[PDB]
């Protein structure tokens, strides 16, 4: 129960149009052999090219939808489509490229996967909705063997060069022509009734079938993301650090304490309705306010209807919606909403305009909808501190800022402690906003109300 067994049966019904006469009884072992690969009982870390649905989830940062549409079978040319939007045409002699022989097409393939995956994964997983031509064309750009390391580093090998006879990871594969030891998963194996467009369109309106190979590769990875993260949710799976994860989360916790602390001092609300995560703590532990919690897990499909969340006196005080994505927020709210459109290593394309935000855990977030914040306004940057002006020791330059709400800045000149803490909070703030998060507050929020908290 560790890897997908080669002796597992492979349903070949979806392959019998490109491959007429294919035996109904087939195993992964006979399929791989039929594809043109000799897996000579190698106990060297590569037991099967194909992988389980569970292993594919653990390696979602590696998912690349792959589809091959035979333009005219080694007699006819092939359109090679990928979920990166790329379409390469191979000749046997929405970026649509002209016909070229396999020996140049394979070099282009290694460049695209290396540039796409170098910052997200140690491997590639080809997400397939197999009809025959994609598995048979793999021998033209893929080499398999024992697990290896890069010739320039310690990472596992993902590419191979016939010119130099050496192996490399995604970072050092410049000039490499083969894809070494890739992984793959056929979505049609998961038990679907109907074609890719019928099944995909049941959940996604954002990807259209333009009848190009890349459009199918995109609908495939989309349907695979839906089945594993939108409808099935497993927040037990941990994901490795691949970027600023630790700083982004520490920033979110610092921002949350600051934003909520200031809203309670500015408008002195008597009750705070904490709507969201059931494992949440008071972000402002010393706060005078009556803190009441309401459990709601992160919605991965559609955004929560604010009516189905409330139907008890939510109009009294303020409502804290920290990463709790509702359809239209009440006027009396403090909100942090992840913006799914953000470009980052943590954010992977999602289903129906949503995104798969992978930071320790995979959170498929619904599409960012600007109309959710009609009764709110964008919360502006501000740094508030009521702590004493005590240094306790980096080199200084006098800080001048209107948004340093401190006793020292009220007094006229900001102390070194609040200047250091202001720039540290500005860095945590900018870190969080760039990671894709967006802050919104009730229209009455005015930081001018915080100057009177030191009197
Ligand atoms: C406010 C309240 C009280 C009992 S269930 C509920 C809800 O919001 O679902
Ligand atoms: C392991 C891991 C990955 C992202 S956050 C994190 C942690 O230790 O908090
Ligand atoms: Zn390397
Ligand atoms: Zn889609
Ligand atoms: Zn000060």
UniProtKB/Swiss-Prot annotation:
Enzymatic reactions: a 5'-end (5'-triphosphoguanosine)-ribonucleoside in mRNA + S-adenosyl-L-methionine = a 5'-end (N(7)-methyl 5'-triphosphoguanosine)-ribonucleoside in mRNA + S-adenosyl-L-homocysteine
Domain ExoN: start-end pairs: 49-230
All copies of domain N7-MTase, residue ranges: 239-455
Annotated catalytic residues: 67, 69, 134, 211, 216
Tree of life domain: Viruses
Signal peptide residues on this chain, from the entry's feature table: none
Subcellular location: Host cytoplasm; Host endoplasmic reticulum
Spans annotated as GpppA-binding: 351-365
Effect after changing residue 19 to V: In strain: Omicron/BA.1, Omicron/BA.2, Omicron/BA.2.12.1, Omicron/BA.2.75, Omicron/BA.4, Omicron/BA.5, Omicron/BQ.1.1, Omicron/XBB.1.5, Omicron/EG.5.1
Binding site for Mg(2+) 1: 67, 134
Activation/inhibition comment: Inhibited by Remdesivir antiviral drug (GS-5734).
UniProt-annotated binding residues for Zn(2+) 16: 389, 408, 415, 418
Binding site for Zn(2+) 15: 200, 204, 207, 222
Entry binding sites for Mg(2+) 2: 69, 211, 216
Annotated binding of S-adenosyl-L-methionine, by residue: 274-280
Amino-acid positions noted as binding Zn(2+) 14 in the UniProt annotation, renumbered to this chain: 150, 153, 169, 172
Subunit record text: Interacts (via N-terminus) with DDX1. Interacts with nsp10.
Known role: Plays a role in viral RNA synthesis through two distinct activities. The N7-guanine methyltransferase activity plays a role in the formation of the cap structure GpppA-RNA. The proofreading exoribonuclease reduces the sensitivity of the virus to RNA mutagens during replication. This activity acts on both ssRNA and dsRNA in a 3'-5' direction.
UniProt name for this protein: Guanine-N7 methyltransferase nsp14
Species whose genome carries this gene: Severe acute respiratory syndrome coronavirus 2 (2019-nCoV)
């Amino acid at each position: 129960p560790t890897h997908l067994s080669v002796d597992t049966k492979f349903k070949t019904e979806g392959l019998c149009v490109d491959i007429p006469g294919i035996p109904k009884d087939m195993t992964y072992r006979r399929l791989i052999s039929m594809m043109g690969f000799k897996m000579n009982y190698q106990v060297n870390g590569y037991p099967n090219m194909f992988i389980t649905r569970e292993e594919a989830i653990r390696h979602v940062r590696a998912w690349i939808g792959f589809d091959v549409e035979g333009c005219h079978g080694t007699n006819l040319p092939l359109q090679l489509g990928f979920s990166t939007g790329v379409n390469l045409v191979a000749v046997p002699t929405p970026l649509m490229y002209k016909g070229l022989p396999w020996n140049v097409v394979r070099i282009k393939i290694v460049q695209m996967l290396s540039d796409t995956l170098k910052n997200l994964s140690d491997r590639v997983v080809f997400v397939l909705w197999a009809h025959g031509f994609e598995l048979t064309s793999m021998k033209y750009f893929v080499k398999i063997g024992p697990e290896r390391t890069c010739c320039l580093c310690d990472r596992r090998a993902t590419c191979f060069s016939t010119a130099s006879d050496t192996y490399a990871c995604w970072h050092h594969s410049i000039g490499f022509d083969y894809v070494y030891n890739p992984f793959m998963i056929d979505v049609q194996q998961w038990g679907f009734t109907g074609n890719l467009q019928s099944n995909h369109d049941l959940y996604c309106q954002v990807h259209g079938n333009a009848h190009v190979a890349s459009c199918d590769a995109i609908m495939t990875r989309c349907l695979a993301v839906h089945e594993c993260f939108v409808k099935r949710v497993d927040w037990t799976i941990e994901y490795p650090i691949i970027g600023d994860e630790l700083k982004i989360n520490a920033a979110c916790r610092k921002v949350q304490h600051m934003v909520v602390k200031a809203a309670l001092l500015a408008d002195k609300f008597p009750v705070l309705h904490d709507i969201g995560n059931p494992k949440a703590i008071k972000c402002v532990p010393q706060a005078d306010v009556e803190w009441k919690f309401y459990d709601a897990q992160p919605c991965s499909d559609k955004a929560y209807k604010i009516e189905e969340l409330f139907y008890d006196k939510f109009t009294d005080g303020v409502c804290l919606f920290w990463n709790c994505n509702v359809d239209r927020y009440p006027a009396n709210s403090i909100v942090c909403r992840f913006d799914t459109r953000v470009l980052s290593n943590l954010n992977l394309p999602g289903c129906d305009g949503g995104s798969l935000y992978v930071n320790k855990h995979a959170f498929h977030t619904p599409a960012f909808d600007k109309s959710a914040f009609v009764n709110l306004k964008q919360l502006p940057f501000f740094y508030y501190s009521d702590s004493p002006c005590e240094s306790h020791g980096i080199d200084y330059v006098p800080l001048k800022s209107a948004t340093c709400i401190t006793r020292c800045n009220l007094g006229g000149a900001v102390c070194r402690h609040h200047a250091n803490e202001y720039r540290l909070y500005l860095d945590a703030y900018n870190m969080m906003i760039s990671a894709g998060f967006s802050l919104w507050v009730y229209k009455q929020f005015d930081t001018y109300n915080l100057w009177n908290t030191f009197t």
